[PDB]
Design a protein around this nucleic acid. Structure first.
Lengths: 93, 77, 17, 63, 102, 46
RNA sequence: UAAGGUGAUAUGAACCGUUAUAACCGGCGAUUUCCGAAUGGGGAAACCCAGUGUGUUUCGACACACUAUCAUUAACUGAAUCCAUAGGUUAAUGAGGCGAACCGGGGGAACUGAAACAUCUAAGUACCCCGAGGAAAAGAAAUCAACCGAGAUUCCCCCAGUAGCGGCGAGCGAACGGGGAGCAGCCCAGAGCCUGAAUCAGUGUGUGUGUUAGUGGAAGCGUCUGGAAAGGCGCGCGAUACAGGGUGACAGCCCCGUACACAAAAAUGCACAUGCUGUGAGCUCGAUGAGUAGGGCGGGACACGUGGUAUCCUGUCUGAAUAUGGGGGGACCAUCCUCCAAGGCUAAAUACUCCUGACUGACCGAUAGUGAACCAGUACCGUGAGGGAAAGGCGAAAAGAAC
RNA sequence: CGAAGGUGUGCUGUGAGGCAUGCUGGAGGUAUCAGAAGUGCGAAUGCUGACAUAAGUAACGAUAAAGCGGGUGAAAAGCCCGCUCGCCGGAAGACCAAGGGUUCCUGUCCAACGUUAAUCGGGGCAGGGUGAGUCGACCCCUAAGGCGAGGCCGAAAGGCGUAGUCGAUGGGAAACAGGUUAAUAUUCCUGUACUUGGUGUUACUGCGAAGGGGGGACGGAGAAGGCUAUGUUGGCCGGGCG
RNA sequence: UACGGUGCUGAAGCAACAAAUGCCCUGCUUCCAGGAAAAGCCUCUAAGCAUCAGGUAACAUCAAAUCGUACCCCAAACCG
């Protein structure tokens, strides 16, 4: 079985921003970066195991990369996916 | 395709000299005809696309021999 | 520094006939 | 360390592969993202270790 | 198979400071070595608001070509070429002109 | 003034897309010529 | 191999290693997402959606594998009618696509030349299509010659702009023979006697050598000018190493190298020896390629355009002899000479260079040389096929100008 | 103790030229006698780059229109705030598809870009921003049409086409109101709902298709009736009497 | 009030009239030019299965994935 290490790989990092802080303090939701595919079921399962918390629902979105102008060369940032994980009344982190 | 299934005759291109020797590209077609040959080995009729010359060689040589040669060539009748 | 690509058709001349 | 686990059985070597991913791999990535990971060479070391363990599993298991 | 190594007593053969002895600090992959106390360069260090604010003029060491220095013999008081020889299966360096092991 | 070029992603792909080119041999030859010339954009696509 | 390393633009941060499991290089393995012949189905390429069979914490839901088409073979099934066949299912093997030229075959121009233009030339060229290899094709005389003789094919130099063909215009243009490169001849259409009987092909072992990492590799100092000498001056040294490159101006003796002598655990090419498997000597007798040769009509190839036109090939219609027989010897006939078609295989001499290594240049030196010396077939232009640039240089060293 | 090149001067040859030297330049150059040529440019409406001319001339892109105070700033006719004036108002307003692809919002910068200035911007740099069982796509079905197992036909390539499989511009299940962010919401929050499937339980029962039927399922024009969106007025509530 | 805004509170919330190109209306009445297809859906059976499976009703539970979602969109952002 490889569901285990898959859950250890779908999370990538947490997202920090004033919207992220506002969501956490008001709606008790934490926004974090996830893998490219990172289906909602996998994100929910990963949050359950790693953070030993309970989640109401997970809704994701895909953030398109920006086109940046470095020197005399053009380049595009890599796309990534962020998920708004919603916790129940009881939360830890 | 206009290809004899026995002798392998195929259309061949060629010129048609006129009275003033003028040349135009033509094409000689084989005298193919769809014929139904009776074979006693299978006790049935087999339809083939053959030319006038092809029907003569079938008439002379055994029908079975032509079929056996045709099978060896790998063409499906 | 591209040389002019589209040159318009010249204006029709006055008929000297 | 490369031959230290070469003489390990599948079960125990599979376990340490599990531990390498669960601890020191997920936790390190969170620290690096949050910015409290002063030393980054751990991420390189752990990733190579996971690869080294993983190849032995394939080399041992099956062929 | 490099004649000049991390810790070597070398003497400059050419340049503005030919003849002065020194110890090699490090060797660059581009065939250049850094020896302290000879190739002083006055670098105008731009100030930075980071943790380090040295500013002013710094006296750094500028790398020099490997061929511009030779290992000091330390016995004949002159520069000498160095070669490689195999002894008990271990490759070692040795001088010339009454060659002796390092 | 309706100019000649009226962009449409669907029509563009179905006329000069990769799958359209590979369907017929001549388009396959076109891809071969592009590859030989080493063009970065082999065809038109998002 | 190793005391230095963590690719570059490109400093840093945080670390590894220094006598060996840092890094680097080579051999053999593992990993190898999605698109793409794409092959589970579909599709606007890098996307969407399934079936089946194997294994699994909350039924939840996951993981792995398989599932295209065609060709050949086998098995299992199975219509119109008993049998049968077509057909259907399963399994095994192979094929598929890409690639610069060279090679063979199937098609095949026009411009142009003729001072016009139609036969002709351009030209079996460009181009399109198919197939195969490292070369391919061709090929062991139904050939030439001359009644003297030569003995497969291919390629080069002559014969030779000769003989010939030709609105006898423009143009096309051999052969015989001579000199070289390289050499090789065999099998089936069949029975008996003798039976691994040679030569080969597919795989082991051993030997030799090559390839994929490498190692050692000689010999110079003092003074003058100068920012710095490799230069000037003086006296030495090595050389089976003054081929090259770098080094603060031009180095045989400062460095990397070169001459030269050595090295391969492993994986492989070639040349031999020695085993296994498969096909197969030799002798006797016999046979010795039929809708073929040839012919009529229409075309093509032959230098040879139907001309007196031999020879080969073909669309069409006909049609022998078979060795006391047949074909050719440039209309044709006779006499002579020569060969034995209608079944196949065959190395070398030759052609080409997408790619790798080494070396060379009375070749270019940034408007040149590849379109591109700088991440160029890029930016940019076009719906698309397609077109397609400009742009090299600080210094020995950033010491890239603190204040 | 200074090559080629560059820039002057002085000599010399009948000419193309040659020689010497000052300054710049910074490391290559080359006698003589021979050999080989991409061997000499002023023109080709020549090619490429650079720079003049017209010339500080035309123009500065709808004749809807601006004025003043204050603010920031080195600098304000153009930016921000306020008070006035003017223009659109079946649009020059408000929402979508197509097509763009970060132009969105915040901080910061004014070289280039904006036909002027610029503190401003759809400009440069950094960060942030797109939340769905119900919206759309995907998905189920099909039109025109495409492809097309076998098959038929064709020198080859390939053409046509059956079973099939694709193809929305059509058909098919389900959400509204209010609030919130500098930037998203019918997606987030609150309130109240709805639809399609899987599993389990209970009570009954015959179920069962690429098969049959029904339904889905449809034109133009015209008229009347019943309603709503919406508007006006009155009442009511709050404020005002200048 | 970082002077942009934030927080708190919150009365009345009815009637009449007019009225659509919108809804009833895939309607109705007429005319010739006679006005898609298939599936979801409803219903009847074949093969086969009927102590089953399956279906119906009620309750409980679970699932509803994946992609688009900014902004312009009669325009300074699309085609010129």
């Amino acid at each position: 079985m490889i569901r285990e290490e898959r859950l250890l790989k779908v999370l990538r990092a947490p997202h920090v921003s004033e919207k992220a802080s506002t969501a956490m303090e008001k709606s008790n939701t934490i926004v974090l970066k996830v893998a490219k595919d990172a289906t909602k079921a996998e994100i929910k399962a990963a949050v359950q195991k790693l953070f030993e918390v309970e989640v109401e629902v997970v809704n994701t979105l895909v953030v398109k990369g920006k086109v940046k102008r470095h020197g005399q060369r053009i380049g595009r940032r890599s796309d990534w996916k962020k998920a708004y994980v919603t916790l129940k009344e009881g939360q830890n982190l | 395709s206009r290809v004899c299934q026995v002798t392998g005759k195929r259309p061949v291109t060629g010129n048609n000299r006129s009275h003033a020797l003028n040349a135009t590209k033509r094409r000689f077609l084989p005298n193919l005809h769809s014929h139904r040959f009776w074979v006693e080995s299978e006790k049935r009729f087999v339809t083939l696309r053959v030319s006038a010359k092809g029907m003569r060689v079938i008439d002379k040589k055994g029908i079975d021999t032509v079929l056996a040669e045709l099978r060896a060539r790998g063409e499906k009748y | 520094n591209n040389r002019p690509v589209y040159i318009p058709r010249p204006r029709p001349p006055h008929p000297r006939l | 360390m490369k031959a230290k686990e070469l003489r390990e059985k599948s079960v125990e070597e599979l376990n340490t592969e599990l531990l390498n991913l669960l601890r020191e791999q997920f936790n390190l990535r969170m620290q690096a993202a949050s910015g409290q990971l002063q030393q980054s060479h751990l991420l390189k070391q752990v990733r190579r270790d996971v690869a080294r363990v993983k190849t032995l599993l394939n080399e041992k298991a099956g062929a | 198979a490099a004649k000049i190594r991390r810790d070597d007593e070398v003497i400059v053969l050419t340049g503005k400071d030919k003849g002065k002895r020194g110890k090699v600090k490090n060797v660059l992959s581009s065939g250049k070595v850094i020896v302290e106390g000879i190739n002083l360069v006055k670098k105008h260090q731009k100030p930075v608001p980071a943790l380090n604010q040295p500013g002013g003029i710094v006296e750094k060491e500028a790398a020099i070509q490997v061929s511009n220095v030779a290992i000091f013999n330390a016995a004949t008081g002159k520069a000498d070429r160095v070669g490689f020889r195999f002894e008990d299966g271990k490759k070692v360096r040795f001088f010339k002109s009454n060659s002796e092991t390092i | 003034m309706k100019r000649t070029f009226q962009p449409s992603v669907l029509k563009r792909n179905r006329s000069h897309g990769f799958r359209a080119r590979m369907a017929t041999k001549n388009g396959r030859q076109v891809l071969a010529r592009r590859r030989a010339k080493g063009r970065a954009r082999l065809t038109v696509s998002k």
